[PDB]
Amino acid sequence: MAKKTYDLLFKLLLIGDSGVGKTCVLFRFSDDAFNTTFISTIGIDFKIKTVELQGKKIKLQIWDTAGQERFHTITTSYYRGAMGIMLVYDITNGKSFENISKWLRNIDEHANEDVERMLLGNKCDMDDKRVVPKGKGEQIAREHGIRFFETSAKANINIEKAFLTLAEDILRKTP
Amino acid sequence: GHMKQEELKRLYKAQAIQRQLEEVEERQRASEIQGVRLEKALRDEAQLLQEWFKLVLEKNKLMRYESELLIMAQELELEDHQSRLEQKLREKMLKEESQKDEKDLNEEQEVFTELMQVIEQRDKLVDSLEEQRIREKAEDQHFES
Ligand SMILES: Nc1nc2c(ncn2[C@@H]2O[C@H](COP(=O)(O)OP(=O)(O)NP(=O)(O)O)[C@@H](O)[C@H]2O)c(=O)[nH]1
Ligand SMILES: [Mg+2]
Numbered sequence: 186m187a188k189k190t191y192d193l194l195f196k197l198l199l200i201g202d203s204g205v206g207k208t209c210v211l212f213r214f215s216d217d218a219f220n221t222t223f224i225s226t227i228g229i230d231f232k233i234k235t236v237e238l239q240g241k242k243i244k245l246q247i248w249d250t251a252g253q254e255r256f257h258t259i260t261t262s263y264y265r266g267a268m269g270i271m272l273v274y275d276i277t278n279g280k281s282f283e284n285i286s287k288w289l290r291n292i293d294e295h296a297n298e299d300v301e302r303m304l305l306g307n308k309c310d311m312d313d314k315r316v317v318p319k320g321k322g323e324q325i326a327r328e329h330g331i332r333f334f335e336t337s338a339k340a341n342i343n344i345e346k347a348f349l350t351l352a353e354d355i356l357r358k359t360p
Numbered sequence: 361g362h363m364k365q366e367e368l369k370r371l372y373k374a375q376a377i378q379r380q381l382e383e384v385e386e387r388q389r390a391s392e393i394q395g396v397r398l399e400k401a402l403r404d405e406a407q408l409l410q411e412w413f414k415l416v417l418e419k420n421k422l423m424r425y426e427s428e429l430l431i432m433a434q435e436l437e438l439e440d441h442q443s444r445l446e447q448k449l450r451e452k453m454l455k456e457e458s459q460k461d462e463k464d465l466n467e468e469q470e471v472f473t474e475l476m477q478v479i480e481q482r483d484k485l486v487d488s489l490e491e492q493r494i495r496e497k498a499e500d501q502h503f504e505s
Binding site for chain 2: 190191230231
């Protein structure tokens with residue numbers, strides 16, 4: 186039979202303030218499309234994307250988090266099982282960037298010790314509304330020694346690269 | 361009303377899974393009938409016996425995929441139920457808080473509850489596939505030791 190089977194299962198998590206574009210980032214990675222209508226996430230959700238790295242298929246179970254603080258207590262449940270975590274902020278929203286420090290200590294508080302963190306500056310396609318300088322995004326990522334990407338769910342910038350890099354990070358650390 | 365895009369996508373997946381499944385079933389048969397033909401012949405024998413090995417390993421592969429296909433069909437139905445629950449929840453959610461009765465709050469809560477359940481059910485199917493995978497890797501290692 187021609188349709189093969191996956192060889193490993195990775196569980197990822199997307200966290201960030203409501204409206205940073207977590208869902209759109211995932212939908213671009215899953216279905217390669219983009220919708221402009223803001224439909225806020227309810228509770229929690231996840232998608233399946235299987236991708237090939239190092240010659241071995243990897244199934245990605247990517248959990249999508251509701252940014253609204255009414256569901257924050259739910260998301261905290263899913264930190265422990267996560268193998269990779271996406272911190273997503275909005276370059277057009279200064280408040281979403283200052284809350285990054287707060288999100289990070291929710292990670293170290295709950296998630297496993299060997300968890301892979303990654304910072305995503307979404308909506309990088311909006312030059313005229315940019316509030317957070319790219320340099321500031323790399324600065325704080327460097328102080329935590331994590332990776333950083335300025336992404337765009339609309340223009341499809343650094344989305345495929347972002348997820349694939351997080352997976353290759355996880356794959357290298359398993360022996 | 362006319363069928364929406366996201367439902368149509370789910371539809372083609374389901375149909376495609378059934379086609380794949382039917383191919384598995386017929387392959388499982390064609391190998392069963394061929395299996396009786398090799399068994400009767402024995403009653404170069406020596407190699408005749410490992411074209412039958414090659415078959416046994418392939419028959420094994422078919423069962424593995426069949427198991428995956430059956431679970432795959434269950435996932436889509438849960439995804440279908442999840443969309444319906446999700447739309448039923450946003451309708452209630454958007455209505456003005458000023459005009460919400462306890463009944464309106466309760467039913468809004470029971471759908472949310474029911475919504476989170478199908479998501480937990482979906483997660484169980486994901487784990488189920490992983491538990492099979494680890495069993496078949498274990499078998500594979502021994503089978504090719
Ligand atoms: N221009 C632009 N808009 C984007 C981008 N990503 C998301 N958006 C828009 O920003 C809004 C929020 O997107 P969404 O993914 O729903 O945000 P979220 O992070 O899922 N929020 P929540 O936590 O409530 O579910 C939507 O209107 C969406 O179209 C992007 O890269 N570029
Ligand atoms: Mg969302």
